[PDB]
Structure 1
Amino acid sequence: LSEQALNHEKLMRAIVKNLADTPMVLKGETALYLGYGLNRFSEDLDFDCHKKINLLGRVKSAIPNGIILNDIHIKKDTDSVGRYMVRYATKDNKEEQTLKLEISYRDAPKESEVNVIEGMRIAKIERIIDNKLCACFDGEHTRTKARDLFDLHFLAKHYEEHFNLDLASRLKDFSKDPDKLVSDYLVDVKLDALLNQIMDLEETALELGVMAQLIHKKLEKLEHH
């Protein structure tokens, strides 16, 4: 964890802690990082929220000591989506940084589906798995991002109990051809600063395929406790 990263994290945590008394629910990669022990750094803030709030006002108030807020650019503010570029600097370094902040106002989790971890409102693992699989495999607009392989492996390894039959079946299907995964993701892994040092693509792909196969097989037994 470099100084740039540590400060970035300082900024993210301050924003999410501030939003704890609103309906904002943290999701995605940084939910995993801040909430569930993800073993890579994450940089974006992604939220679901059932209604509009004074987002700008909250971000401004939330800037903690040691951070300089240069600007907030409103990329998109509609009924269904909020998309912002928060530009900032630091007491340790003057070079401008960016934080992407994105909110979805559709299909917000109901209050009974919201976890609180160290004072932060965060989505359940199940929803995060579902969203990742939509994002990398079977959603409306899939993408090829190595982060998704890294994160699904993490989830399959450390949170297998949160997989149900549907989630496991899709995971198994996503990861059935490990050589294709390695082929599909290789360039992205090399170009990703967050992954290129820490990730063995060949091993990750292989282990995911094996873990998914086993998780799904277990759930197919329809066992009870």
Structure 2
Amino acid sequence: SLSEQALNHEKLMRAIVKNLADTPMVLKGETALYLGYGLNRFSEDLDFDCHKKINLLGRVKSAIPNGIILNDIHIKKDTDSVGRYMVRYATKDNKEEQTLKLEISYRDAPKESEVNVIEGMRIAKIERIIDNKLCACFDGEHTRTKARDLFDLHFLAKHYEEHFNLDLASRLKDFSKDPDKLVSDYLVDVKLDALLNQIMDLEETALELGVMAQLIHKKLEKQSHSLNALQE
């Protein structure tokens, strides 16, 4: 769009992720879609998988780009299974303190062969992002109700349909079968979410996703039925 505040935020996020390209850290989730795959809404948090501990504090400080001032890094959590940091910073454009949230999950880690590199950044593959989005908003242990999940899944079905398999498509179809329910579930969150409220038509998105999920699932079935006949 994009505000000057957002621009400095993106610049700090990019420097950090690029700094970690020689570590086993893998960017996932929403900001992976934004920095790596062309997501058309902004994203502000950094989320990683990593199979072992690293010098996070050191890499972050050595990543700080010109124009950004690092005030403090607060370690909310550093355990065997999770890392959670609040990177507090200001800019030359503004001395008002901003926060970058950085989270890491350990032994979630993708195999090294499940990692992409995009513009010098280690990022999760699309199918893993899809799988994790569906878990979080539809069929995981602890689901949630955040309109971003709908926006992102719609973005994924629309622009990356070739990365869905039968299982992902089937779940996406299940999730999106009742477009009215989706509107009911998300309308409040959409209007309150400043990353969405000016760009998202919730009704259109809900309708369009339900139908795309049908198509994707249908194509994959026809592909399967066709493959079998050919195999004989």
TM-score, structure 1 as length reference: 0.98
Count of equivalent residues: 225
Deviations 1:92-128 (A, max 9, x none): 0111111110001022011111100000000000000
Measure how far apart 1:77 and its partner are.
0.6
C-alpha distance in 2 between matches for 1:6 and 1:37: 16
Deviations 1:68-108 (A, max 9, x none): 11111111110010011111111001111111100010220
C-alpha distance in 1 between matches for 2:62 and 2:4: 23
C-alpha distance in 2 between matches for 1:93 and 1:3: 10
Measure how far apart 1:12 and its partner are.
0.2
Deviations 1:31-56 (A, max 9, x none): 00000000000000000000000111
In structure 2, the gaps of 5 or more residues are 226-231
Measure how far apart 1:204 and its partner are.
0.3
Report the equivalent of 1:145: 146
C-alpha distance in 2 between matches for 1:141 and 1:92: 40
Larger radius of gyration: 2
Q: 3-state DSSP class of the match of 1:156? A: helix
Report the equivalent of 1:183: 184
Equivalent runs, 1:98-113 vs 2, <5 Å? 98-113=99-114
C-alpha distance in 2 between matches for 1:106 and 1:182: 36
Q: 3-state DSSP class of the match of 1:135? A: helix
C-alpha distance in 2 between matches for 1:76 and 1:107: 17
C-alpha distance in 1 between matches for 2:219 and 2:35: 30
Q: 3-state DSSP class of the match of 1:38? A: coil
Measure how far apart 1:223 and its partner are.
3.9
Measure how far apart 1:141 and its partner are.
1.0
Q: 3-state DSSP class of the match of 1:34? A: helix
C-alpha distance in 1 between matches for 2:89 and 2:148: 25
C-alpha distance in 2 between matches for 1:60 and 1:135: 32
C-alpha distance in 1 between matches for 2:140 and 2:69: 38
Deviations 1:162-190 (A, max 9, x none): 00001000000010100000000011000
Q: 3-state DSSP class of the match of 1:222? A: helix
Measure how far apart 1:217 and its partner are.
1.1
Equivalent runs, 1:1-225 vs 2, <5 Å? 1-223=2-224
C-alpha distance in 2 between matches for 1:212 and 1:172: 5
In structure 1, the gaps of 5 or more residues are none
